Amino acid sequence: LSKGENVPYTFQDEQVRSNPYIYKNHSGKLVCKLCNTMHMSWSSVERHLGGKKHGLNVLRRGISIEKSSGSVGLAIQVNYSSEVKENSVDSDDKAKVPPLIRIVSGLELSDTKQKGKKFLVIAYEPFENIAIELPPNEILFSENNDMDNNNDGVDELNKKCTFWDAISKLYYVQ
């Protein structure tokens, strides 16, 4: 009935769940943490999920989440796969989207130890992100390079100074 899935106890301090709600409390019985309902058997649970009140609680949680949350310059040459693994994924899912760059402040890190400098992060869907430290307060930060044409793409940075050789898979940034 359970489809062989292990439903962890409430106290086990979280393998991804199917429905991330139904638990077993400190006692034996089954619980739905949204609706705060106690169910005796897994069939009653499947009737709860197929019930109307659980849907209402899921939507109310949806709204509850959606309301809150002449100089010197640098040039980088990033190379990508040679049709080695990209042969299994070609379903026009952002495949047309080129790599993207953003300047991030080190004030926020997974470890939060030291900080105080910027990073020129570069990202592509499958591959892993990449960063480059920029101690200099400003370099190559130009002044109206082109003649003010407005296709924002992502931002002034990307259109202003990036090139994506998609035929060879080479991303240049300067």
Partner: protein
């Protein structure tokens, strides 16, 4: 007796807060709100000391002093007469309103000019119901800037009840 605290790492625990702020002063209680949805704190707290002096001293000493996980902690501290007036002249500035109504009563706030229907109207805030009684007595249905103006009480049906006179009298006293 309670002080606000902000810019808190969600990784901070009530234990760590208590250990921090007991250095400054005895802390009666710490209300450090958690989101019970995510079991994740919101990054702010309320620290209630025993008296006011400890609260003020803690505000002075601990504001922008300490960095918890590089994050610099923040420590901070934490009914009147109204008249509707209709058919005003477009030549009447709010300051001219002030000069008009000051002789009648002292304004707790500034008047509010708004257009109904085209129709220039305003709300005038007096500190006294009796001074407003003077303003209505003299100014009601009176020609200013070559325009007849009407002065009455603003609706809430309007102000000027008996309980209104009593409790406004008390708030003044």
């Amino acid at each position: 007796n309670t002080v606000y605290v902000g810019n808190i790492d969600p990784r901070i625990t009530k234990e760590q807060l208590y250990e921090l702020f007991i250095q400054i002063n005895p802390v009666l209680r710490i209300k450090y709100p958690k989101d019970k949805v995510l079991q994740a704190y919101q990054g702010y707290a309320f620290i209630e000391f025993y008296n006011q002096g400890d609260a003020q001293y803690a505000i002075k000493i601990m504001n922008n002093t300490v960095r918890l996980y590089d994050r610099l902690i923040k420590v901070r501290q934490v009914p009147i007469a109204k008249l509707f007036i209709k058919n005003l002249a477009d030549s009447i500035d709010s300051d001219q309103l002030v000069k008009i109504f000051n002789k009648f009563g002292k304004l707790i706030r500034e008047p509010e000019i708004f257009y109904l229907s085209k129709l220039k109207c305003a709300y005038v805030y007096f500190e006294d119901f009796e001074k407003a009684d003077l303003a209505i007595k003299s100014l009601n249905n009176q020609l200013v800037a070559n325009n007849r103006i009407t002065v009455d009480y603003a609706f809430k049906n309007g102000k000027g009840n008996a309980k209104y006179g009593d409790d406004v009298d008390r708030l003044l006293n």
